[PDB]
């Protein structure tokens, strides 16, 4: 509510809601993420 939106990381009313993980559940990592391993980008700098 406002012209300035809530930032979802710092607000416990987002973080601990039913659509996210409450602080009384067991806090482990949900799923692993391998991004860089599956499909990797070649290095091209913006600068020469």
């Amino acid at each position: 509510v406002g012209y300035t939106p809530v930032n979802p990381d710092t607000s416990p009313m987002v973080a601990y809601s039913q659509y996210h993980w409450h602080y009384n559940l067991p806090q482990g990592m949900e799923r692993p993420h391998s991004v860089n391993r599956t499909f990797a980008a070649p290095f091209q700098s913006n600068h020469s």
């Binding site: 973080a15 993980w21 602080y23 067991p26 806090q27 482990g28 990592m29």
Partner: protein, 350 residues
Amino acid sequence: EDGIRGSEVTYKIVLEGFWDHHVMKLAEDVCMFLKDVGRQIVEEKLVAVRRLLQGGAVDPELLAAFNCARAGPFGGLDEYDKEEVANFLRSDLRRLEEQCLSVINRCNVPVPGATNIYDPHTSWPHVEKLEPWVRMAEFWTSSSDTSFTELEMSTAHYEFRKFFRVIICKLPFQSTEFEKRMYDIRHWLHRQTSCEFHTIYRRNVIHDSAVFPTEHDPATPTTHEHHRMFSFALDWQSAPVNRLSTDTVHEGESWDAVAQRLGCSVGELKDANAERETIEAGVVINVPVTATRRLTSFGATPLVLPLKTTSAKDGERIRTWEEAAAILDCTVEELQQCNGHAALTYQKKE
């Protein structure tokens, strides 16, 4: 030291959550992880040690390291034979097996009904508590332009908190592999929890009596006056001082005369200079690093250039700047920096 109280390397991982139970359960997780990885590494090291105990040669290099002393405790150059050295090596490996076994045996204590990760006798790594960070915020809940009283009467207290557990692992040796697993636990940490890594390891330092020689106090002492504010920036160089490793041989000089002037044995001065068999006047020589009389850069006595009979340019007096700058082998601007009087009066040094 034996048992729990001693190690080569200590890592302390300081875990921090927003809620106490978070950090407690994280510490159980990470702890059991390092228990397994630790047992694997230390077991590997243990088999390497048991093999080295069973037998092996000795480096020529390790033997050389036992035998570098000008005099040992019995007052002469001591000859360690390869046997003795191997025996030192062996004794240390013995101790390392005891330590490895101690770590492994504590890895195997903490079973499911019986797990206590707080005491260090019962587990590896163990866990220490660390007092929580608690900041209390005091503030007005009122929005009132009119009265200070009403603002004070509405005051709230809320706290920010941060909770900490510490994980201690002491290892008998250093393994980059363990260190790697450990740094990488930051990628799988629990939600909204972070960590620090404290390392305390053992490292060889080297004290050079060559670079930091031990000499008598100077013939003139230093006052409180070399210690004013900004004396640190003005009156002192950073240690160590530069002592020249190179000296030029004067005309009348000889091997032993040069050695005497530099404070060496003639043997030393010949070893450092091994290329040269004989030393002529005006030749550049290497000063053996142990020499007692080595000179410091730019002695406190100023080089003076008198005008006198100069070059063949006059044969009477020296005159122009670029001339004296060619003589002293320096920039003309430096030469001018040093001499204020001769630079202000004129450039032809009238």
